[PDB]
């Protein structure tokens, strides 16, 4: 009912620096005398955690580095300095009237030194062959930034059918990303070809990291 | 110690109502408001309605009025929400929150409801040992493949939870009405295979607790 918009939608801030988050309102929530604007921190898989209520007053247990301000419709939350465990989507909510509404979302991400992924290729297990399946797994662990492309090659030729990808959220300590790719194939298709290469291009190096295995062993 | 304990995950067919419980402990149940919040996967937060455990007093969001009903039992100190005839746009994470005017102080874990009209399928656990060949050295990675299951979630554990520091758990991605999820653990070469590293996989719907030891191929 009362629209709350957050700017920007996503911000990148280096460790130890200042981050500014805005929350615009369609109606003045500060009515009657005091501001009824709350702030929340939500890490993936976890419920939102209340940081600051009424724009100014912080909740007990929350560090003083989390600071909020504003009145009427324009409200701002700042974190100074930022830490590795600040990776979360931050929300502003309003009380006042009439059905309670949350903000819009603003994802916080940390900029650090560029890291190269440690690539590890895994052949299908012996129990996969008995079931009739064949999944070749490839893990890309601890790298920055998030932008990465994985290309599967079977016997020198690229394969894009049956590729399953999943990206992790930023680490609460390392502030790094991780990705896993799997070739969902059948036993009939697996035994016909020999070489399987996992290839990944990144900003850290022009040469792609190629990890491969042969079925012949 | 104020706590809110919500129920487990839920799989429902379209056109079936469901009750979601929220157990409260550590405070006087009848003296505080309890708000309920909906979260569409990969989206923002939605306020559903509040309930006062003292007596029958509720106010709902106009978008949820004819769908959500709130009840509270004083003797068991549990807040319960019923959601009538669930659709595709109802598959979300529902939260219960304790509110002391006018901010949500304490939260539950959140119940993940999925609809979803597919059959519940058993997960298949596959151990991922390093590429064939008697070791490589330095620091080797181990993996665990969970292929073809329904529905969410799957709780992944390594050695009952002792070696849970260098673990990368990947979010599940749906393919052809089936979920797939992987986990990788990176350990030093000195502690493998001298120390036995096991993969603990648990699934609620199929009621399966498959434990698999990763042994060199």
Numbering used by the authors:
A (entry chain A): 1 to 217
B (entry chain B): 501 to 717
Task: Quote the paper.
Chikungunya virus (CHIKV) is a mosquito-transmitted viral pathogen that causes fever, myalgia, rash, and severe arthritis in humans. The E1 glycoprotein participates in cell fusion, whereas the E2 glycoprotein binds to cellular receptors and initiates clathrin-dependent endocytosis. Most neutralizing antibodies bind to E2, as this glycoprotein is more exposed on the viral surface than E1. We also describe pseudo-atomic resolution structures of CHIK VLPs complexed with Fab fragments from four different neutralizing mouse monoclonal antibodies (MAb CHK-9, CHK-152, m10 and m242).
Four cryoEM structures were determined to ∼15 Å resolution of CHIK VLPs complexed with the Fab fragments of the neutralizing mouse MAbs CHK-9, CHK-152, m242 and m10. All Fab fragments bound the VLPs with one Fab fragment per E2 molecule. The crystal structures of CHK-9 and m242 Fab fragments were determined to 3.0 Å and 3.1 Å resolution, respectively. These Fab structures were fitted into the cryoEM maps of the corresponding VLP-Fab complexes. The coordinates of the E2 B domain in the VLPs did not agree well with the B domain density in the maps of the VLP complexed with the CHK-9 or m242 Fab fragments, suggesting that the E2 B domain had a different orientation in these Fab-bound structures than in the non-complexed VLPs. The footprint of CHK-9 and m242 Fabs onto the VLP localized primarily onto the domain A and did not include any part of domain B. Indeed, binding of these fragments to the VLPs had nudged domain B ∼10 Å sideways, out of the way of the Fab fragment. The height of the density for the variable domains of the Fab fragments was comparable to that of the CHIKV glycoprotein, suggesting a nearly 100% binding occupancy of the Fab fragments under saturating binding conditions. However, to block receptor attachment it is necessary to block all three receptor-binding sites on every spike. Such a stoichiometry would require substantially higher concentrations of Fabs to inhibit infectivity, as seen with CHK-9, m10 and m242 Fabs. In summary our structural studies suggest that the CHK-9, m10, and m242 Fab fragments neutralize CHIKV infectivity by blocking the cellular binding site on the A domain of E2 and that the CHK152 inhibits fusion by stabilizing domain B of E2, preventing exposure of the fusion loop on E1.
